[PDB]
């Protein structure tokens, strides 16, 4: 039912992706070469019927409890869960001046991500694009 999107940084062309197509909690999300058809699962999101950032491996939610983003399920009550696409930026719901930030603008495939007091940097830019 849900159509789903790539998250893609400006920085590399590179997408968000479930390290290791792992889906129990606390995986970390990671920068990786974009992946296209059955196999591209884990980097493939949806909004929910709210418009809150879920992955199609697990409908986890994107989580910043850590220093390093990783998966958790979806609650409603946590703040550190609620991320939503804005503009060219991936937002926290509650706090609009945080946003997704590939850490140290590191290029390399695998780079870790955190949420970041938003700076305008290509670090944050992240392009929404459908599958
Ligand atoms: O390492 C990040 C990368 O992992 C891929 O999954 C690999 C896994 O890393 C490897 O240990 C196993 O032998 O093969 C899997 C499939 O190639 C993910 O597919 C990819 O999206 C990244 O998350
Ligand atoms: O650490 C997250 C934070 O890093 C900034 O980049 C810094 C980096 O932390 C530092 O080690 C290096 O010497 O200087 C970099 C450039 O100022 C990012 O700008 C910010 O977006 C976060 O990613």
């Known amino acids: 039912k849900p159509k789903f999107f790539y998250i893609k940084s400006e920085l590399n062309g590179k997408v968000l992706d479930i390290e290791g197509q792992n889906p129990a909690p606390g995986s970390k999300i990671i920068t990786w070469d974009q992946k296209k058809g059955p196999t591209a699962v884990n980097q493939l999101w949806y909004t929910d019927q709210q418009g809150v950032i879920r992955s199609k491996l697990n409908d986890f939610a994107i989580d910043a409890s850590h ?5 958790q399920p979806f609650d409603p009550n946590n703040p550190k869960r609620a991320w939503i696409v804005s503009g060219n930026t991936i937002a926290q719901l ?3 001046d945080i946003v ?5 603008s590191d290029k390399e495939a695998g780079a870790h991500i955190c949420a970041w007091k938003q700076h305008g940097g ?10």
């Open 67 to 71: 220093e390093q983003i990783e998966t």
């Open 122 to 131: 290509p670090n944050q830019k992240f392009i929404i694009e459908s599958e």
């Open 94 to 96: 509650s706090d609009r």
């Open 100 to 104: 997704l930030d590939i850490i140290k």
